[PDB]
């Protein structure tokens, strides 16, 4: 079966995030957990998707740049997906699924990276929104729109960002656990950042 | 004589959307449902066709994006085209009635749809609107211009979405006339939402 | 010798627009016909001619499109070219007229009009507007930049428009008569749409 | 020594304009001219140069057009100069007047024709302004960036244009000399548009 | 046991910089040190990493400038790297800093810079921001813009500049170790000008 | 020694500019003449080097420009370089003083300039501002953005002229030290205006 079934992380607020790292090979099937943060998305999450994206800078002087990670948060589930080079057809799913117009899928400083996967990819998020400016519009807060994601959730949450911190801090120590702890926190600040300002 | 004798789907408001799919092959006509499609927007829906787009992404790095589905929409009805690949002569009836000045041509999230019909296709929609942009400036709520085609509807109209989120949820498993369904339903939604903004 | 010779037709505020359909071989000259529409635009007119354009859509993917007719109407003109492919020597005097700082060319959604234009016939209009972005500024009405021929018309003058829709609504059973009858009434409307605007 | 020796004309105000037509061959000197048009421009025009631009239109797709025609008008003064094709090294005079920061190069409807100077001919005017946009700018008046020469010049100075009309009204049929004339009275206007702005 | 044992420097406050001075080989491992660089921000610099960076001019173009070093600077810190010509994998930590979403790269006129970091080195920082113009809107103060890094220092925190000023006023003949002084002194000028913008 | 020994001009306020001309071949030393130029910035001129470029035009077609002259210019001084073509590697020093971000480099209708220094000679100025735009901008007055050098610094200043108008006005007659008195006079004047606008 197919279940977020790696560690679960307790939020500040007492929540829970569900969890589920994937080793993409040639044949790894991905679309069943796809499919799961798309129903959690419409059912539980106001149809969005939280996402941010990884590179490994190979050695036209970006097109070395491949996308060796993606996560994909809701409310209650991040799906980190872990990426071969080059990609296969299963790969597919994920572009289909990145095109989709059923949600908006949400990130911080997403503007070269969007770049990067056309160019490199041709990986196309026909519904993507780059959060800060948004965050900056509405708040009439210049600068959110220069913020990273953890800074960003702070002025627009003022949440308890201690446990994140602490990970992030020593960033190079942290256990492959602690860090995806600290991907599954960002995610859900970020979920309830674009809930606090769709709402607003 | 050429009707949309299809599925008819019953929307919230009690009225009934007509529908037809077409599989277009090398020598489908497609000319009579266009004609219809065109009329019934002239006489009953205020020259508005809404539209949405549906690729097989194949693997310069966007150019392997192949069209491969079309949705055209009224009050009244829609009509579904899959299309092949490659084009044959007979489709130029789609360009000519994408090119046409008789009516705008109603979109959620096209920004990126546009640019990949007009380099991959030569598919050009000269009088098209991408109306999350103009929902957001009219309603003055910036968030409209990111919201995906349900929540766009949601967040102008607010009626009931149920059925609609219930297909969708369950995407990988809805069954072709299931997903025709949803189709036909988002086309009303964004009728609604264009005669709800062209007014205001 | 040059006259409007062709079919004549009747506005719904009782003035005419006379107009000439020329079908351009190798050998024609078109200058006395553009010549009477410069000269309607200058001491009729107000100085604008406006203009559609129709293309022949063949199969740089939009590097097949081809000009297959341009109107120009003035008050009380209205010229209807049918071009051939490919263009001779004695198109240069059309490339001539579309240059001039005389008159204004008042266009309804020309933007990727302008683009087929220069990219596949080296065709340069120096002075052109897109005409519904200055409608809908001029009156605050945000929809206007989006609307087709028709639906500006009636969103900015409120006039009459049973007969062009009863055309447009059966176009594909409409004679090169009604067709030419249909671009004529098209033309006059959007004289005045222009007229109006530049008063504002 | 060198001397602006054509046709004077009358403008509706009651001053003069001075005249001069150079038809440039591989050997003419034009620099006795433009150093005319610069002191001119300094002591009596307040540092402006109006300019307008002809090209032959010529079988990328613009790359065939080339630059036939020049005008450089002030205060006082009319330069028409007539272009061979190709250029010889003896336009290098013009490359260099029109790259002067002295004065400033005001044109009517010009955006096209930097691109096609730059692109044909590597001719750069460093300080330019297209004056409508200026014109609708200053003024608040959205249309004046949309009109021609003689229509422009109408909606800031509203002053009596019968003249200049009957010459472009039959353009086809005015002599060299009409035509001059025409360019020379547009010269004036623009002229005084610009001190209209500038001053305002 | 890595640290910041290079020179350090007394700020006009009365704080203490440290530097560290790393000459990258094919071999150097950096990335303890920018571990320092991005603990000390996450803990003490509100999550902020003041830069600059130094190009070798070469003889498109531009494809000669070549990345000398780059300087990182937090409140108590300043890291310099020099950087080799033909980079080898021990410099993908750099890139990966670069692209880091945990902090925000604050620089003074870094638009060129970006682009040639990209063009040429394929270098991407997605979370980057140009402080004057942040500076400018914030303040309200145009100019702010478009001034060098003391003279922003300067207009927005009027503080003094005498030993700054002494060691640029003389820059040729000041040796390493005064440059390197400069560049730490700009380095906390800068993470001050960022820190009264960033919350006030 | 390195100083500015040519001839010495006094300005309408009884200051005084000081100037020196280089001819630069391959192996000129031009760096003691620049560190001379900032250090007047940085200690007596608010750290602005105003400049302006002058180009041998060329027959991409803009390729062929080629960079002849640069003048530097500060509170007390006006340097004036003529370079050579093709430029040597004694130019290197030119190159990295225009990437100095110790001062703003001050133009006048600089926007092809840098755009012609970028592609032509991959000369990049890192800290540049186009004046007029500012002077525009700050002082609510449009039309500044078009001015030229001398008409900007009047529109700014309101200063006499009369000296450096009836130079210019015959600039073809200029000796070689009345066109640098020119250059002079107007490198004080931007330097005035900058020093104006920067207190706004």
């Known amino acids: 079966s197919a279940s977020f079934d790696g560690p679960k992380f307790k939020m500040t607020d007492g929540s829970y995030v569900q969890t589920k790292t994937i080793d993409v090979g040639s044949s790894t099937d991905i ?3 796809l499919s799961l943060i798309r129903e959690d998305s419409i059912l539980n999450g106001n149809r969005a998707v ?3 994206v990884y590179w ?4 036209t002087k970006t097109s070395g740049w491949s996308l060796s990670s993606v996560k994909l948060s809701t409310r209650n589930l991040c799906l980190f997906l872990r990426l071969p080079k080059p990609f296969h057809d299963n790969l597919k799913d994920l572009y ?3 095109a989709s117009k059923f949600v908006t899928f949400v990130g911080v400083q997403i503007e070269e990276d969007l770049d990067l996967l056309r160019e490199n990819h041709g990986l196309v998020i026909r519904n993507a929104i780059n959060v800060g400016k948004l965050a900056a519009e509405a708040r ?4 959110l729109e220069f ?3 953890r800074e960003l959730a702070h002025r627009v949450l003022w949440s308890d960002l201690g446990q994140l911190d602490s990970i992030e801090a ?3 120590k942290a256990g492959p656990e602690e860090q995806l702890e ?3 926190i960002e995610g859900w600040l970020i979920v309830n950042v674009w809930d606090q300002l769709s709402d607003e």
């Open 31 to 33: 679309s069943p957990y």
């Open 50 to 52: 939280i996402f941010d």
């Open 56 to 59: 490994d800078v190979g050695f």
């Open 96 to 98: 289909r699924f990145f």
């Open 140 to 143: 009439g807060t210049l600068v």
């Open 147 to 149: 913020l990273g994601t």
């Open 170 to 172: 020593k960033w190079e």
């Open 182 to 184: 600290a991907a599954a």
